[PDB]
Amino acid sequence: RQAITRAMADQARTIRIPVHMVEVINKLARVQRQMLQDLGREPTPEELAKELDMTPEKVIEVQKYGREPISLHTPLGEDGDSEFGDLIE
C-alpha cells in the first residue's frame, strides 16, 4: 500500500502535487464527503475549514490545487468535427 500510494501521489496527476499536499487534499475531500453524507447538504466553507482545523484560505487554496486538466482534443459538442483546442486564442 505504501508503494502504491506513493506512486499514485507522485505520478497520477498531470500537474504534479507534493505528497503532503496530496494527503491534505485527499483528507479534506474524504472528510467533506463525510460532511455531505452526514448533513445531507453541501457544507459551507467555514464549517469545512474548522473541521479541517485550518483557516478558509487554505481550504480554498487546496480546493483549487486539487483539479485536473481538460483535454483540448475533445469534441466541442457544438459540432462533431470541432475540437476544443481550436477555439481558445
> In the complex, which residues of this chain contact DNA (CB under 7 A)?
1-2, 18-21
Looking up cell 483528507 gives 27
What minimum distance in Å lies between the beta carbon of 86 and DNA?
Answer: 23
Q: Measuring CA to CA, which residue among 71, 72, 67 is closest to residue 87?
A: 72
What minimum distance in Å lies between the beta carbon of 88 and DNA?
Answer: 28
What minimum distance in Å lies between the beta carbon of 42 and DNA?
Answer: 26
**Smaller CB separation from DNA, 19 or 36:** 19
Beta-bridge mates of residue 83 = 75
